[PDB]
Ligand binder design. Structure first.
Ligand SMILES: Nc1nc2c(ncn2[C@@H]2O[C@H](COP(=O)(O)OP(=O)(O)O)[C@@H](O)[C@H]2O)c(=O)[nH]1
Ligand SMILES: [Mg+2]
Ligand SMILES: [Mg+2]
Ligand SMILES: [Mg+2]
Ligand SMILES: [Mg+2]
Ligand SMILES: [Mg+2]
Ligand SMILES: [Mg+2]
Ligand SMILES: [Mg+2]
Ligand SMILES: [Mg+2]
Lengths: 50, 81, 101, 208, 346
RNA sequence: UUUUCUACAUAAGAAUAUCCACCACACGAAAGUUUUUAUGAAACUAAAAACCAAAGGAGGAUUUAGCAGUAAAUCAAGAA
């Protein structure tokens, strides 16, 4: 592992628009969480019954 | 930049370069030839055969040809015919 | 009329769960974060604990929409096995054939 | 059984095919064979035309395989043939010229011999009469007897070893002792024979 | 096939023999186990000579001891015969009365060590007494004459109550490292560095043979009680042994070998030097002579069969036909290690 | 012991129930105690490590299944 490697990583991610600064496996769930459609909102759920 | 980061094996500042340098150091010290230049050494056709052979061995990888080039270059380099 | 009372109950839990969806989402975000202070997270904890729990997602139960049966439903048709088979065997379900191989 | 009764067995021996010209009824027979447009089975993967194939060794190989391991059984057998081989070389070089003429160095001949010698002549079947089961003397067909020998060798060198002892070794010992008839396997064959001799009267009971 | 001693060119694919005392003398260390079987079976130690063995030996004939240490490499497919083509060299130049430093499998160092001892004398290096002691005990019987001759110029401390001061024969050092086993490794490294120091003199003609060099820079199985894996760096034995391949010195010759069989973390099929050694290995290994080792050619093959028939080791009836030859040829792809096994049960 | 481990795909290296005071180890912990993590509003749920290592040493009467790519062993996927 190098610093050049690290800076390239940062560069790439901040380019493609993914996570910027180093973050826990835990906290990433927040990203995943807004990045989705919350389960209760899915048309396949709330509109279940005619 | 780190030199392990590269996509090529550049002969410049290589470890193979240092190793040959020491090799020809001991080769001159054994032959009682007092001529010492990194210029003189690095210039020779032999060190060039090794440039090409090791650059091709790192970048192309393991091959029959490539080790025949390694064979010949180290052959002439170490005086084995 | 929905076919059962159980259905009414779960219809309502669907409507609830659509209602509060974003409160839930937003609050839970802080709650699931290791970056924030714990202090925030305790209060937020009390906050999702606050909102009506008939409005929580896991309290929802897929049923057979026609027949109301709580288990045996096939997700794709939202039907109980009995009803599904019943349809598929008059041939009223498209593209479903009795499988041989 | 994905073969209908229409599919007859392959005959895999090459010596048969290369040299037909001196045999009339067999010429007639294999003519009938392929001319019949006979659907014939894809030859098995275990059966090969290898000059080195001994069917007896194959059977004994199989009967040693637990689960689906051909690899492992093959290896254990290989190591047994090997083990006997080297053990007999060791007996050879440490011996006197006379015994050098005596000793069998072929692990294969040693194997066919140690099995010929372990096979029982008669065996028992239970007969129900008047409420009691009598064990009665039955003459046996060869293949059943072969099976009994092999089964016995395998069961014997499976069961009674001390756990630090590998299979191929013990198996080799039992093979070489059964060669000289002094081995436990033959004790078993003999207890068969004795049990048959004690019950010989009851050989009336058997009706077939 | 006819022979006298190791070095002859026209004798390619002929049977060289050695004695049992020659064998206990030259290989106190391991001989390849399959071949130890061959020998204990046939009462006769027998071998054939190959084109790479010839090549290597002729390079060893032209050697200049004024020149820096020269590296050689034997590479090839699994069971392709590259460890015995090391021993050819071994007993040749041991009959030429040289110093023979032979490590049969480096891999036994890197893997399966019951006792990992911690030594901070060397700043976090681990010593492996089990291996050290065995290696020394073989090395004793290896070269006896040379052991009383070598006079080490150093001061060395085994214990607070134990020391040896300069002017001592080397055999003393060795056997004193064997007697007290806990420090055996330290004594191994010491013997090593002083061996390389004394190689400057004309008394030392050093053949350093390490089979399974890949072990040196490879990734290691052994682990600390924290479950943390330990580098090849962290091993006293290895750290000291890399120093012996370094080409810094005169009078020596290093023949090396890249194994697949004993290795760790490498795939089964990789016989190529750069793979087995990897970047660190290849790089730290400097120009060397890459000697390919391959299958028996037809002549060597019918030679091997000749030899096996000669010993009546083929006990199958039909083994004598051209049929048997074609079978064993096709099943083995005429590979030395494969044919060995095909004959064992035949 | 046709076993167990690591490498690894199917040629390897080591371990191997008794020495003996091992600084216990051979198989066998799926069970428990602890810590995490997954889910979830709610852990009582699942998984993973660390520890611990027990009964078990091939099982009475009697019984189940299988006729070939089957039995047996091994691996992976889906439904909810
Ligand atoms: N006759 C003969 N046999 C050899 C020779 N080299 C190796 N062998 C045999 O072939 C087998 C394979 O050799 P080995 O060097 O151990 O192969 P490796 O596993 O790739 O290192 C060994 O068991 C030897 O007994 C040789 O030069 N002559
Ligand atoms: Mg539910
Ligand atoms: Mg080898
Ligand atoms: Mg093994
Ligand atoms: Mg558990
Ligand atoms: Mg325990
Ligand atoms: Mg017990
Ligand atoms: Mg029954
Ligand atoms: Mg689902």
């Amino acid at each position: 592992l190098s610093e050049y490697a690290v800076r390239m990583s940062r560069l790439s991610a901040r380019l493609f628009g993914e996570v910027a600064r180093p973050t826990d496996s835990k906290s990433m769930k927040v990203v995943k969480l807004f990045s989705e459609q919350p389960l209760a909102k899915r048309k396949e759920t709330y509109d279940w019954y005619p | 930049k780190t030199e392990a980061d590269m996509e090529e094996y550049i002969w410049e500042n290589s470890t193979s370069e240092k190793n040959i340098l020491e090799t020809l150091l001991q080769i001159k010290a054994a032959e009682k030839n007092l001529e010492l230049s990194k210029e003189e050494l690095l210039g020779t056709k032999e060190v060039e055969d090794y440039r090409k052979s090791v650059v091709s061995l790192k970048n192309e990888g393991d091959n029959e040809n490539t080790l025949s080039q390694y064979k010949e270059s180290v052959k002439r380099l170490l005086n084995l015919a | 009329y929905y076919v059962d009372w159980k259905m009414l109950r779960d219809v309502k839990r669907r409507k609830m769960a659509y209602e509060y969806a974003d409160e839930r989402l937003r609050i839970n975000s802080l709650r699931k974060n290791t970056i924030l202070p714990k202090d925030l997270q305790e209060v937020a904890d009390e906050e999702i604990a606050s909102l009506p729990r008939d409005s929580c997602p896991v309290r929802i139960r897929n049923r057979c929409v026609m027949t109301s049966r709580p288990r045996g439903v096939k997700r794709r048709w939202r039907l109980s096995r009995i009803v599904f088979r019943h349809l598929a065997d008059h041939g009223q379900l498209s593209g479903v054939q009795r499988a041989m191989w | 059984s994905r073969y209908g009764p229409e599919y007859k067995d392959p005959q895999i021996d090459k010596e048969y095919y290369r040299k037909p010209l001196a045999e009339q009824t067999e010429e007639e027979k294999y003519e009938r064979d392929f001319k019949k447009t006979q659907l014939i089975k894809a030859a098995p993967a275990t059966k090969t035309s290898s000059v080195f194939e001994d069917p007896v060794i194959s059977k004994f190989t199989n009967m040693m395989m637990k689960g689906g391991n051909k690899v492992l059984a093959r290896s254990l057998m290989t190591q047994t043939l090997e083990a006997v081989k080297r053990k007999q070389f060791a007996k050879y070089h440490a011996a006197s010229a006379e015994e050098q003429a005596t000793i069998e160095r072929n692990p294969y001949t040693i194997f066919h011999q140690a099995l010929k010698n372990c096979e029982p002549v008669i065996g028992l079947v239970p007969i129900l009469k008047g409420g009691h089961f009598y064990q009665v003397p039955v003459p046996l067909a060869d293949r059943r007897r072969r099976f009994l020998a092999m089964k016995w060798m395998i069961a014997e060198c499976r069961e009674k070893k001390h756990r630090r002892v590998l299979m191929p070794e013990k198996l080799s010992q039992e093979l070489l002792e059964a060669f000289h008839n002094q081995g436990p396997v033959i004790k078993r064959k003999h207890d068969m024979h004795k049990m048959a001799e004690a019950n010989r009267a009851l050989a009336h009971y058997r009706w077939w | 096939x006819x022979x006298x001693x190791x070095x002859x060119x026209x004798x390619x694919x002929x049977x060289x023999x050695x004695s049992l005392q020659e064998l206990k003398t030259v290989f106190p260390h391991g001989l390849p186990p399959r071949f130890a079987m061959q020998v204990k079976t046939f009462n006769e130690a027998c071998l054939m000579v190959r084109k790479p063995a010839l090549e290597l030996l002729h390079y060893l004939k032209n050697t200049n001891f004024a020149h820096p240490a020269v590296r050689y490499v034997l590479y090839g497919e699994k069971g392709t015969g590259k460890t015995l083509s090391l021993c050819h060299i071994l007993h040749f130049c041991a009959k030429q009365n040289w110093l023979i430093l032979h490590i049969p499998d480096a891999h036994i160092w890197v893997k399966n060590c019951r006792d990992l001892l911690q030594s901070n004398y060397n700043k976090q290096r681990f010593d492996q007494p089990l291996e050290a002691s065995t290696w020394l005990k073989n090395f004793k019987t290896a070269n006896e004459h040379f052991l009383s001759q070598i006079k080490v110029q150093e001061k060395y401390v085994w214990n607070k109550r134990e020391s040896t001061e300069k002017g001592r024969p080397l055999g003393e050092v060795v056997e004193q490292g064997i007697m007290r086993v806990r420090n055996a490794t330290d004594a191994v490294g010491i013997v090593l560095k002083e061996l390389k120091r004394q190689s400057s003199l004309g008394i030392f003609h050093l053949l350093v043979a390490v089979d399974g060099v890949n072990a040196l820079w490879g990734r290691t199985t052994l682990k600390r009680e924290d479950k943390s894996p330990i580098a090849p760096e962290e091993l006293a034995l290895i750290h000291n042994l890399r120093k012996m391949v370094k080409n810094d010195w005169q009078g020596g010759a290093i023949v090396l070998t890249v194994s697949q069989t004993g290795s760790l973390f490498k795939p089964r099929n990789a016989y190529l030097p750069q793979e087995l050694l990897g970047k660190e290995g290849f790089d730290a290994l400097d120009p060397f002579i890459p000697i390919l080792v391959s299958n028996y050619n037809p002549k060597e093959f019918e030679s091997c069969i000749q030899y096996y028939l000669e010993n009546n080791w083929l006990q199958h009836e039909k083994a004598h036909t051209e049929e048997g030859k074609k079978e064993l040829l096709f099943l083995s792809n005429r590979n030395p290690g494969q044919l060995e096994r095909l004959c064992a049960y035949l």
